[PDB]
Amino acid sequence: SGPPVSELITKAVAASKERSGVSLAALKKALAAAGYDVEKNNSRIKLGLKSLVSKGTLVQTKGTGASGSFKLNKK
DNA sequence: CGCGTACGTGCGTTTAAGCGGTGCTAGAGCTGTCTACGACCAATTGAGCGGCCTCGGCACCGGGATTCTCCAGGGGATCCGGATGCT
């Protein structure tokens, strides 16, 4: 089975936690370093990030849609 | 917009370009010869082009396969949710 991508993205945004949000390229490279097939899952990571920001668990800093930088919620 | 990177620039260092000087020569160039060669021209011809006439290679027409495209099925790959196993 294996944990879905959303928990991996939460660990990715919690890995560094610099002042600005974590970027799309940084989270892709974080998935590559932790171990993930980022090549065939671009639509997957796009829909996953949109789904998680729609819940409000993570908020958008600067960009629009899948672009920009991504940082976690208030609490 | 963001990330990775690839020059920009600013320091020092080595060097070889740059400058000044000198000798030698080999080729540039000028002059004289003269011989090979091209221009010109009378005469005349055979190749080169207009005219013409036929015909088969080809442009148009039509019928059938094949490959490209697109769409539908649908399959399945793996995922997002989740059902849930079981822990």
Swiss-Prot record:
Q: Which residues carry this modification: Phosphoserine?
A: 1
Instruction: PTM Citrulline: list the residues.
Output: 19
The places in or outside the cell where this protein is found are: Nucleus; Chromosome
Give the N6-(beta-hydroxybutyryl)lysine positions (modified residues): 17, 29, 50, 55, 71
Q: List the disulfide bonds.
A: none
Start and end residues of each H15 domain: 1-74
Question: What PTM annotation applies here?
Answer: H1 histones are progressively phosphorylated during the cell cycle, becoming maximally phosphorylated during late G2 phase and M phase, and being dephosphorylated sharply thereafter. Citrullination at Arg-19 (H1R54ci) by PADI4 takes place within the DNA-binding site of H1 and results in its displacement from chromatin and global chromatin decondensation, thereby promoting pluripotency and stem cell maintenance.
Similarity comment text for this entry: Belongs to the histone H1/H5 family.
Q: What is known of its domains?
A: The C-terminal domain is required for high-affinity binding to chromatin.
Illness the protein is tied to: Rahman syndrome: An autosomal dominant syndrome characterized by intellectual disability and overgrowth manifesting as increased birth length, height, weight, and/or head circumference.
What job does the chain carry out? Histone H1 protein binds to linker DNA between nucleosomes forming the macromolecular structure known as the chromatin fiber. Histones H1 are necessary for the condensation of nucleosome chains into higher-order structured fibers. Also acts as a regulator of individual gene transcription through chromatin remodeling, nucleosome spacing and DNA methylation.
Other known facts: This variant accounts for 60% of histone H1.
Protein name in UniProt: Histone H1.4
Organism for this UniProt entry: Homo sapiens (Human)
The portion of the full protein included here is 36 to 110 of 219
